[PDB]
Design a binder for this molecule. Sequence first.
Ligand SMILES: [Ca+2]
Ligand SMILES: [Ca+2]
Ligand SMILES: [Ca+2]
Ligand SMILES: [Ca+2]
Lengths: 122, 122
Amino acid sequence: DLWQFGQMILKETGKLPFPYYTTYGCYCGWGGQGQPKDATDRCCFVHDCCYGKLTNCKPKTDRYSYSRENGVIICGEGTPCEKQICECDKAAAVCFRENLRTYKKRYMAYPDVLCKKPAEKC
Amino acid sequence: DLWQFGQMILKETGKLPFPYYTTYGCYCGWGGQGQPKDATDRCCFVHDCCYGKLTNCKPKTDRYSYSRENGVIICGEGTPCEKQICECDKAAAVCFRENLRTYKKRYMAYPDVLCKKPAEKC
Ligand SMILES: [Ca+2]
Ligand SMILES: [Ca+2]
Ligand SMILES: [Ca+2]
Ligand SMILES: [Ca+2]
């Protein structure tokens, strides 16, 4: 579920989702309505894509099993939906971490007015 | 700033902003575009209002001083903007807490499609 996604983001990035991810840029922080401005910003678009492929799942509310004991997110047992949701969430939290180097504090609470309409597709 | 707002929300509600507040309902979780669905949901609308009154401030990025030593948020010294931002943030975190009793888990990630256009005004 979203609370597990939150915890993954924290564990991978050492940052809490709010305000660092939830308000970032034109896609994370504008609810999906603008073209991703940078890589961090696209991570959310990819995550939205990975959720869209799960037509038979409830990725926001289904609770999966994962372990992070040894520094690595390990997706555990559960239903096929739960596993697939977990993998969407892991992959996004990893993407945020891999892209800390280009993370810009300026894109936080970025004014929506400057956001362009969506262009990439899943 | 938003990170301080985040910490106030956590301290008052015992919940992290994401996903409990950032995705709630039609105003908190839909970036301000729908009519608040309930009281928790209006708290965000009031907070948006309190920020709007601060035409001469940067409420998202200005860092104020507050203390929560004794269970109560005490807004400290700083510029008049910093004080006023702090009071906006305190008042919203208190509103969320006062309204935990009517908090509905269903409004988390509420489908935007069912959201009505804004009606109340600041
Ligand atoms: Ca980036
Ligand atoms: Ca990042
Ligand atoms: Ca409520
Ligand atoms: Ca509440």
